[PDB]
Design a protein around this nucleic acid. Structure first.
Ligand code: MG
Ligand code: MG
Ligand code: MG
Ligand code: MG
Ligand code: MG
Ligand code: MG
Ligand code: MG
Ligand code: MG
Ligand code: MG
Ligand code: MG
Ligand code: MG
Ligand code: MG
Ligand code: MG
Ligand code: MG
Ligand code: MG
Ligand code: MG
Ligand code: MG
Ligand code: MG
Ligand code: MG
Ligand code: MG
Ligand code: MG
Ligand code: MG
Ligand code: MG
Ligand code: MG
Ligand code: MG
Ligand code: MG
Ligand code: MG
Ligand code: MG
Ligand code: MG
Ligand code: MG
Ligand code: MG
Ligand code: MG
Ligand code: MG
Ligand code: MG
Ligand code: MG
Ligand code: MG
Ligand code: MG
Ligand code: MG
Ligand code: MG
Lengths: 177, 260, 67, 60, 144
RNA sequence: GGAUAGUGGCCUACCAUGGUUUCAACGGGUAACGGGGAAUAAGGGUUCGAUUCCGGAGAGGGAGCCUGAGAAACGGCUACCACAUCCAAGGAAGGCAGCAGGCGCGCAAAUUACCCAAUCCUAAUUCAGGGAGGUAGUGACAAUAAAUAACGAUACAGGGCGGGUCUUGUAAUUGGAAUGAGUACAAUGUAAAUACCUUAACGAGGAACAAUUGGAGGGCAAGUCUGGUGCCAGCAGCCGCGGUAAUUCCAGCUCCAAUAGCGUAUAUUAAAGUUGUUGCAGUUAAAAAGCUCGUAGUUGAACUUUGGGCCCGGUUGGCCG
RNA sequence: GGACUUUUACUUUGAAAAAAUUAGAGUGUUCAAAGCAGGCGUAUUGCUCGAAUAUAUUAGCAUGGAAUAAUAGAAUAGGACG
RNA sequence: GCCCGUCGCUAGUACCGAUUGAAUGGCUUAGUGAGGCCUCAGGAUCUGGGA
């Protein structure tokens, strides 16, 4: 009777499970952008392989086939609108080539670091969670925002966060009492 | 299976009613009436979903029981009444009137119309034959029988309906070059006015249509609804007059209205 | 905090078109209660097993004080 | 072949290992904090290059 | 052409010839004949709980020489009798014959595993509790 | 002709001898309801669909029927079979493959709770009714997001270019910061509650708010560390380990993998070009009938208006804009 | 309207075409799985975009093509046009 | 060196086998036949030929 609540998975999994070449490599990415799960990496490989064998499929169509452009130009719009594809690259032969790290450097937990304002890449992840920084009045506690380079302009802290103008905060207030 | 089904699950509901899946389990099963079940729309969705006058279903019943609503003239208090294409819904409060007319996306659109226009009607005649005592009658897409029409009305033609009373006065004909309205398939919504009609004795005569953008298409004759003369209709078409904007056409103009 | 509300062209129109669980939220209609739904269902069934008044079977149950 | 060999020695050596107790350690960090330390531990001060490097050298 | 008919109209021959020749695949006949249910004392199920009749100790196959501690079990859904290994150091002391035990395959598609000659099942739980959770003294065996 | 709502061997009477089949009839099997669909990602495929939607069938097993617009209805009746309850022994009553709950079966699956507020449905009908349906509880089925920490100062030390002033940081005293897990005025939420969202008051330093699960000879990532055992006990999907210095067992230590999850069993798909149409193999590894005929099936040489001419206007892109 | 038409296979395009599923556009659910919303002012009594597209493919229908592969035609002329 | 078969031990599997062996389901002859339905009667009554 119920209508079926749709779901899906967000992470693939390496077939060879112990390729230490790719396993060190995986961790360098992990301990760089501040990730907890190697499946935060496996996750963002997944969409990439989707974008690719979405995109790779379009360059088979006869050049400028009706739908190849509609969702072609729909695709490259989506990725510059988050700023992973750079503005030179909006004719979609180069979207096949989005090496993974581009996606990670466009996180929230990442740019909150590259804007200064994160002493470490992990001071980032720790304050995002804790009622700290926002974009509008809209607090965000998801270190995987994928900020869209438009709203990257306003990433100052929140008004209720006692690091960007607030009341003292919970344990300060009786360190002083 | 032991007689009449009287329930309608969701996702059995007609898509063009645009109900969200999770609001329960069921759509409102339209009642029996003028319009085919799958080819109609009930009052409770009109007053609740597309037009958002009422919040819940319980309210829609409260609304109708005050004789507020009229369709084609009459009080018509059936919460699930099968109101269909080309009906008129006068609304006593607000002095609003709506003719029921498709988009070119094929759904039922909200379309306010004049008080003058709110008192005539058309119908694709679906049958014509003699009857009791030999008085001929026409019957049309909407479920009414007009006794004593002219011998010149054959079948497949539209008819003006006074609907303060019964009779017809004018009857547009089905010939090469009359304004048509596709009322099925999903060329549903597109418009205009002939190319020609392939006979195909045995069934399923094919109707060729040329929209007023020099774009052809074909649909079956059962689903072509002549509505008059080139560019000269006999009712008020809705916005964009059904000329099947492309996906890129539609989103090029989608971003044409770009600056606030 | 976004929401949704309505104002009425009178307060008799409010009290008559409004769901009555709201006039309880306000103090504008009284809370007065009913027995839990399952209890009265049973009374129905208990009542289905009687044909008529129910007055005139009291007659003959007090009439086996002899028998 | 034979299927009715003895059963006295069931659990013979687990019974008789001198069962040294566990020894208390500091509390290790978790998914980000921990895999951070490996990024450092693996990649910021190389263990050794005397030949090539070992991730668990006991006596070397 | 060395073999198979290539004409555009030989589809039936191609289909029946595969249909027929697929019978040489052992996974394919095992699934079609149905040996899972007819043979294979588990009901084709993932596990089956039984009752232990005797505690045996089985001479290991060569070139090994041990005594593998196992139990003869009578599958309670089937009446079938099956010998099954009790793995870990000890874990014979937990089984307490006439006890109720839960049995699993060996991850060898039947085809008994190791040096233990002809046993294709292992205990997972005696007295319905979590055998390893008794080896590691997480839990206690119930009263009976 | 009869019967049907009506067609019809549906049934009857008469007459005839037809109907299907290797292009697989007929029979058997099915751990078989069909489908929309699900799983598996080069493709071609392979496997699965009791199960939210559509269709069908059934209400313990049959058959029969009343009512009716509609039923061969079972929360209708009647009979038989099986099951089975109450009794004053005369008799009477029961049909959960509805909701919940119980026994049984098993590897295997939750409350005898709340409401018509929503979604819809039915009635004589805005009102009544609705275990349809929705609410909570139970709930590592699956699915998403992602806490268990974050910045210092210092101190021996490295290394930048004697430690100086740039931190690599390894530090076993420190340090003021931050916060929800929890708790809880309150409002919100709700039919009434509950959670969540929001938010006073509380609420973190190792005694914690203390992450697991497997594994560390090979495949396969991580030690020929230490103690134990001595072909014993045990490990080991496979190759193989243990018979007294065990890289493999039982442990302590250290280490790796995944991580609110991870192991095991069973099935299944990929890998599998080991089912091969794409795409296999058949001298000797598995596999050309001893031989020829030969029906079905599959297959089957070539040659029939080609070539030339006039026109129309379409769609890219060029030089121009 | 009349008269009369050798039979096919193949390929094109198109109609007929349920939703949910899938592929996929739009939309910043705080993110995401989702959902089909939402977005704007004069936030004093309204303004407004939506709810795409794709997908069926075996069979049937409709239509364009005449290569490829079949069937049939005048030989006891019982042929063809009148 | 390798290696074959009878013979003997332990264990497991499946086969053959007196028991005109057993069991579970699906049909089904013959025999008996419930019930409701259709129908020939019936006529407690209850009425204007009907019930
Ligand atoms: Mg209705
Ligand atoms: Mg009630
Ligand atoms: Mg009553
Ligand atoms: Mg063979
Ligand atoms: Mg034995
Ligand atoms: Mg059984
Ligand atoms: Mg006949
Ligand atoms: Mg015969
Ligand atoms: Mg065959
Ligand atoms: Mg079945
Ligand atoms: Mg496929
Ligand atoms: Mg396969
Ligand atoms: Mg199904
Ligand atoms: Mg199936
Ligand atoms: Mg079943
Ligand atoms: Mg029945
Ligand atoms: Mg029942
Ligand atoms: Mg029923
Ligand atoms: Mg008595
Ligand atoms: Mg139940
Ligand atoms: Mg379970
Ligand atoms: Mg319920
Ligand atoms: Mg329920
Ligand atoms: Mg914890
Ligand atoms: Mg602490
Ligand atoms: Mg461990
Ligand atoms: Mg290694
Ligand atoms: Mg070996
Ligand atoms: Mg060890
Ligand atoms: Mg795994
Ligand atoms: Mg091919
Ligand atoms: Mg081969
Ligand atoms: Mg040989
Ligand atoms: Mg030969
Ligand atoms: Mg032969
Ligand atoms: Mg040829
Ligand atoms: Mg098409
Ligand atoms: Mg006998
Ligand atoms: Mg009769």
């Amino acid at each position: 009777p119920r209508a079926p609540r749709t779901y899906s998975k967000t992470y693939s999994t390496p077939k060879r499970p112990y390729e230490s070449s790719r396993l060190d490599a995986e961790l360098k990415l992990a301990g760089e952008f501040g990730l907890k799960n190697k499946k935060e990496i496996y996750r963002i490989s997944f969409q990439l392989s989707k974008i690719r064998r979405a995109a790779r499929d379009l360059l088979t169509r006869d050049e400028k086939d009706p739908k190849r452009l509609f969702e072609g130009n729909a695709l490259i719009r989506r990725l510059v609108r988050v700023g992973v594809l750079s503005e030179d690259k909006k004719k979609l032969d180069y979207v096949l080539a989005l090496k993974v790290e581009d996606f990670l450097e466009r996180r929230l937990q990442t740019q909150v670091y590259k804007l200064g304002l994160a002493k470490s890449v992990h001071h980032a992840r720790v304050l995002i969670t804790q009622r700290h920084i926002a974009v509008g009045k809209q607090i965000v506690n998801i270190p995987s925002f994928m900020v869209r380079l438009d709203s990257e302009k306003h990433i100052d802290f929140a008004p209720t966060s006692p690091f960007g103008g607030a009341r003292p905060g919970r344990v300060a207030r009786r360190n002083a009492a | 299976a032991r007689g009449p089904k009287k329930h309608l699950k969701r996702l059995a509901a007609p898509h063009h009613w645009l109900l969200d899946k999770l609001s329960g389990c069921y759509a409102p099963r339209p009642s029996a009436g003028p319009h085919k079940l799958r080819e109609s729309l009930p009052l409770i969705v009109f007053l609740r979903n597309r037009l958002k006058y009422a919040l819940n279903g319980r309210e829609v019943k409260a609304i109708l029981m005050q004789r507020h609503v009229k369709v084609d003239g009459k009080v018509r208090t059936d919460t699930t009444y099968p109101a269909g294409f080309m009906d008129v819904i006068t609304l006593d409060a607000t002095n609003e009137n709506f003719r029921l007319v498709y988009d070119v996306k094929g759904r039922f659109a909200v379309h306010r119309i004049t008080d003058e226009e709110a008192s005539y009607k058309l119908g694709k005649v679906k049958k014509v034959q003699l009857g009791k005592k030999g008085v001929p009658y026409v019957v049309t897409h909407d479920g009414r029988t007009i006794r004593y029409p002219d011998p010149n009305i054959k079948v497949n033609d539209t008819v003006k309906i006074d609907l303060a009373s019964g009779k017809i006065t004018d009857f547009i004909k089905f010939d090469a070059g009359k304004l048509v309205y596709v009322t099925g398939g999903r060329n549903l919504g597109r418009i205009g006015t002939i190319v020609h009609k392939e006979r195909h004795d045995g069934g399923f005569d094919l109707v060729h249509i040329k929209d007023s953008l020099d774009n052809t298409f074909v649909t079956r004759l059962n689903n072509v609804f002549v509505i008059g003369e080139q560019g000269k209709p006999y009712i008020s078409l809705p916005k964009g007059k059904g000329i099947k904007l492309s996906i890129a056409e539609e989103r090029d103009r989608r971003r044409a209205q770009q600056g606030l | 905090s976004v929401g949704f509300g309505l104002v009425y062209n009178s307060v008799a129109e409010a009290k008559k078109f409004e769901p009555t669980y709201r006039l309880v939220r306000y103090g504008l209609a009284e809370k007065v209660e009913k027995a839990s739904r399952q209890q009265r269902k049973q009374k129905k069934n208990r009542d289905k097993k009687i044909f008529g008044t129910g007055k005139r079977l009291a007659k003959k149950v007090a009439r086996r004080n002899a028998d | 072949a034979k299927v009715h060999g003895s059963l006295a020695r069931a659990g013979k050596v687990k019974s008789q290992t001198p069962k040294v107790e566990k020894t208390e350690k500091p509390k290790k960090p978790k998914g980000r904090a921990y895999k951070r330390l490996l990024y450092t531990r693996r990649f910021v001060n190389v263990t050794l290059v005397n030949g090539k490097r070992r991730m668990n050298p006991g006596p070397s | 052409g060395k073999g198979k008919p290539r004409g555009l109209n030989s589809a039936r021959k191609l289909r029946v010839h595969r249909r027929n020749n697929r019978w040489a695949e052992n996974n394919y006949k095992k699934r079609l004949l149905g040996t899972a249910f007819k043979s294979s004392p588990f009901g084709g199920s993932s596990h089956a709980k039984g009752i232990v009749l005797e505690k045996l100790g089985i001479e290991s196959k060569q070139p090994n020489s041990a005594i593998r501690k196992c139990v003869r079990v009578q599958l309670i859904k089937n009446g079938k009798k099956v010998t099954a290994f009790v793995p870990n150091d000890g874990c014979l002391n937990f089984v307490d014959e006439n006890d109720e035990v839960l049995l699993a395959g060996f991850g060898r598609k039947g085809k008994a595993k190791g040096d233990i000659p002809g046993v294709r099942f292992k205990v997972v739980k005696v007295s319905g509790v979590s055998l390893l959770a008794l080896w590691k003294e997480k839990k206690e065996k119930p009263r009976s």
